[PDB]
Curated annotation (Swiss-Prot), chains A, B:
The keyword Coiled coil does not apply. This is Soluble cytochrome b562. The chain holds residues 23 to 128 of 128 of the full protein. Heme b binds at M7, H102. Binds 1 heme b (iron(II)-protoporphyrin IX) group per molecule. Electron-transport protein of unknown function. It comes from the Bacteria. The gene is cybC. Residues 38-60 are annotated as: Disordered.
């Protein structure tokens, strides 16, 4: 529930998806990711600790989780359509969204 | 952070949106809604208290917030395009997602 644990869950489940052999394994990992991002939403990263809760930076930080949550859902839908490799590929591409936030706020 | 508080935030800001006369009012209310939904993600509703956290019903409960969060985002994007009335209309139509969950799980 702290920001570290949420980030590990995100990281770990990205690796679970990469190594997965069926759609159920992918779905489970993706829902775990979504829950971690949702929980991360209310956090203040150390580098934005001096900004007000409703500053543009804090809004944008939260928006970074918003984008990720949408994209995790896109990958979930691919898995439900039986597109295992495509869902795995979509999950890998999530790193772009991971990195976008890290570059600004980590 | 309770399920009650989160539902009030959601309800109250839906009313703020309806009464809004500018884009900024609509944007702010929508982000507060998204934050409440994200926070509600980890909750177990009274009716699903005897179900396991990874039961289909619990996944579907969480999925209800997932759908809502995407739809709030859609309304947010309308506002950012300057389509204020359209964003207000989109926010009002969120109620069907509100009700979809209430019907199953409230
Ligand atoms: C699936 C996507 C993501 C993955 C796999 C991921 C992974 C990680 C990992 C493993 C760490 C700790 C290791 C390190 O700092 O070197 C970390 C830190 C961090 N992440 Fe992420 N992350 C993701 C998405 C995001 C997003 C979307 C945001 C912002 C909205 C974010 C914000 C941060 C911040 C602020 C830290 C530093 C934490 C601290 O120092 O307390 N991350 N991330
Ligand atoms: C913007 C849409 C929503 C609005 C305006 C809203 C509003 C409310 C309000 C005012 C209440 C308290 C009144 C009552 O219980 O009669 C409530 C309760 C509740 N809502 Fe919602 N809600 C929304 C979305 C959702 C969603 C998407 C879910 C499911 C994922 C959900 C699940 C629940 C549950 C389980 C309760 C009862 C909680 C308890 O008794 O402890 N709501 N909602
Ligand atoms: Cl911390
Ligand atoms: Cl499969
Ligand atoms: Cu879905
Ligand atoms: Cu957006």
């Amino acid at each position: 529930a702290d920001l570290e644990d949420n980030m590990e869950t995100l990281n770990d489940n990205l690796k679970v998806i990469e190594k997965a052999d069926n759609a159920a394994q992918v779905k489970d990992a993706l829902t775990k990711m979504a829950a971690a991002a949702a929980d991360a939403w209310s956090a203040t990263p150390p580098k934005l600790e001096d900004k007000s809760p409703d500053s543009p930076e804090m809004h944008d930080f939260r928006h970074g989780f918003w984008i990720l949550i949408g994209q995790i859902h896109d990958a979930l839908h691919l898995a439900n359509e039986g597109k295992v490799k495509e869902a795995q590929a979509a999950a890998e591409q999530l790193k772009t969204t991971c990195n976008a936030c890290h570059q600004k706020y980590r």
